[PDB]
Design a protein around this ligand. Structure first.
Ligand SMILES: [Cl-]
Ligand SMILES: [Cl-]
Ligand SMILES: [Cl-]
Ligand SMILES: [Cl-]
Ligand SMILES: [Cl-]
Ligand SMILES: [Cl-]
Ligand SMILES: [Cl-]
Ligand code: NA
Length: 129
């Protein structure tokens, strides 16, 4: 599914991401725009053989099982395919674990390079939330 901006903001708010670990909703929407262009079916392969999955491009090196990332972990206890669902619940639940892991939203390279320190409230402007 390709989400609309306000549609995704509403779905992330319903799932408890607004101010989760102090990150306002616009941060999460900004991260999803630049990671996946709001497409739940986004995948990208990494040089190390790991793959990033879904709207927040969660990596199989640590967070999910895809059966093709040798020596990796599965810290969210999910098949990576779960992160491509039209239902964002698995993505949001795993993202909460990642953002609690010590580096906050710096875990997401697109967030650090494209959202951090910008007017992220712009991403939820105009939305009925
Ligand atoms: Cl947009
Ligand atoms: Cl915000
Ligand atoms: Cl594996
Ligand atoms: Cl594991
Ligand atoms: Cl699995
Ligand atoms: Cl959803
Ligand atoms: Cl933090
Ligand atoms: Na894995």
């Amino acid at each position: 599914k390709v989400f609309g901006r306000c549609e995704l903001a509403a779905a992330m708010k319903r799932h408890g991401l607004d101010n989760y670990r102090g990150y306002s909703l616009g941060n999460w929407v900004c991260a999803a725009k630049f990671e996946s262009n709001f497409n739940t079916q986004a995948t990208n392969r990494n040089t190390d053989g790991s793959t990033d999955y879904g709207i927040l491009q969660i990596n199989s090196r640590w967070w999910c099982n895809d059966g093709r990332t040798p020596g990796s972990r599965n810290l969210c206890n999910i098949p990576c395919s779960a992160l491509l669902s039209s239902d964002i619940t698995a993505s949001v639940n795993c993202a909460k674990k990642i953002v609690s892991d010590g580096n906050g939203m710096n875990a997401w390279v697109a967030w650090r390079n494209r959202c951090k320190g910008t007017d992220v409230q712009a991403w939820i402007r105009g939305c009925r939330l």
